[PDB]
Amino acid sequence: HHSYTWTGALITPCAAEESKLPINALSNSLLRHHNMVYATTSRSAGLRQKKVTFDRLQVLDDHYRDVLKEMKAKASTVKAKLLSVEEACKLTPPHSAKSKFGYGAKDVRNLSSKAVNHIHSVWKDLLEDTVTPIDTTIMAKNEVFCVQRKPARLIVFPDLGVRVCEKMALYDVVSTLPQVVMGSSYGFQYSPGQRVEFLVNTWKSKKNPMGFSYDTRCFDSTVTENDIRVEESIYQCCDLAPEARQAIKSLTERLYIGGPLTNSKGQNCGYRRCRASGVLTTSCGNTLTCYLKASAACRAAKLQDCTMLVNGDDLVVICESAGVQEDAASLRAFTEAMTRYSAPPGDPPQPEYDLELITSCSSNVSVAHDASGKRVYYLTRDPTTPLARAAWETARHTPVNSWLGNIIMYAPTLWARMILMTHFFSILLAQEQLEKALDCQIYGACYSIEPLDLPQIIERLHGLSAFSLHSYSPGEINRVASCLRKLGVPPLRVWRHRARSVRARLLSQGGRAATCGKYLFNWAVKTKLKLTPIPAASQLDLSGWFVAGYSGGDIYHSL
Ligand SMILES: *SC(Nc1cc(C(F)(F)F)cc(C(F)(F)F)c1)C(C#N)C(N)=O
């Protein structure tokens, strides 16, 4: 029942890997303590292998089965459609890993006969063969972090031709089933603002609110074959075309449940018997399984009025308190149940009586004030990682611009407005690349976005209040100021100064650029403006933006 088995072959890199923070003429204006920022590489793959490799034991009781039965009952009301090859192709990221059969993502998006013909041959094989393990590539991801150094995370994915097939059979499923099964408990249906709203209202729904976050130790590795088959049983409850049922069964048996691992050099590194992190069902599967175990655990632990918020492996639970004494006890029972379900906690869960102190999805609720002086709740986070990555993308061009995603997701925060917005717009101006579309990710899905559209985008997602929030909490302000000292980032007072210049520079550009300067930096000037709704805002088609999670799902949503 081990999560993995290795042969001894090393996880090899597919190209050159950089560990040290690249430095250019712009780096110092943002961050000075360069030694604190690094990128993980395959050099540490071995350390990760040991952490994610362990035996899984599972004891399923009646609470587990009762929840699953309820989940299946809801899933039976879902009707999902098969995606055509062309539709699946359009969902493929322009720069997705190329196939090992003579074609790349570019060929897929263009519907080249070579790509389409191979995809049809892969689809045909899936329908006729439901036993042969599908090959997968295992790689060490290159992610940037701030020291205090974690080993590189592993990524496992099937060939491009197979990924297109997953879309055809399961895209509609993983996109609509979760919300139906988990209702308001499914986190990916909320934008940052709706997320905070659901958290605050739930916290109020309890006479004596009590909540906590639950972090499973290497969730992917705790996912057993049973969990993956139970996930397929849930998918099968949907009203599907017989052809989709066969493909889903085949993908489950041949890919999701497990398979051989091949490094970039073509060598067999071993075998996987747990969750593959690079498949379309990774997000949906983790979410369903976490919600299943956690819901069953809540009953086993005897938690009153348990409301949950689940995002993949990230779990948040809010319920009626029963005294710090009983609360601590119930939590331990919960943890015990989760452990029995094969989902032990990396870090022991602690009860919280302060909403703002609960951290979920690396975020926490906080409060600020609008133009009216009204207390307003918003979503924020520790800016350490966002700033380290911003530093990296400052001197290195990356496939995914985290700074852009962070601005969109945390536009209302103190750090994103004063630092991220100021710094990157300053750069875009100097290079005259304000209207150049950039790729970023939101809930795992890849989006192509032009910086000049940030004003309209933010207005639609967060409202006009985002452009005028003030008087942040002492806790939030202090966490930011501390993070800057740690990384050697100039104080906020410096950023305010720079923003005045960036703002005036944008206003001078006029048009699109003027709108940015006016709305994005209205906080920099002493005498703020009026800031009225933006006409183009509505024209924006931000539908599939916050519907579901697609982490590792190789999904692209052309904007
Ligand atoms: S927990 C989670 N998704 C998620 C990540 C982040 C951040 F800050 F880490 F980038 C912020 C949010 C938000 F804004 F609160 F909704 C959500 C995932 C998992 N597991 C995931 N796969 O996206």
From TrEMBL:
It is found in: Host cell membrane; Host cytoplasm, Host perinuclear region; Host endoplasmic reticulum membrane; Host lipid droplet. Disulfide bonds join 298-306. Residues 209-327 form the RdRp catalytic domain. Homodimer. Interacts with host SPCS1; this interaction is essential for viral particle assembly. Interacts with envelope glycoprotein E1. Interacts with envelope glycoprotein E2. Interacts with viroporin p7. Interacts with serine protease/helicase NS3. Part of the replication complex composed of NS2, NS3, NS4A, NS4B, NS5A and the RNA-directed RNA polymerase embedded in an ER-derived membranous web. Part of the viral assembly initiation complex composed of NS2, E1, E2, NS3, NS4A, NS5A and the mature core protein. Belongs to the hepacivirus polyprotein family. Induces a specific membrane alteration that serves as a scaffold for the virus replication complex. This membrane alteration gives rise to the so-called ER-derived membranous web that contains the replication complex. NS4B self-interaction contributes to its function in membranous web formation. Promotes host TRIF protein degradation in a CASP8-dependent manner thereby inhibiting host TLR3-mediated interferon signaling. Disrupts the interaction between STING and TBK1 contributing to the inhibition of interferon signaling. This is Genome polyprotein. The lineage of its organism: Viruses, Riboviria, Orthornavirae, Kitrinoviricota, Flasuviricetes. The chain holds residues 2422 to 2983 of 3010 of the full protein.
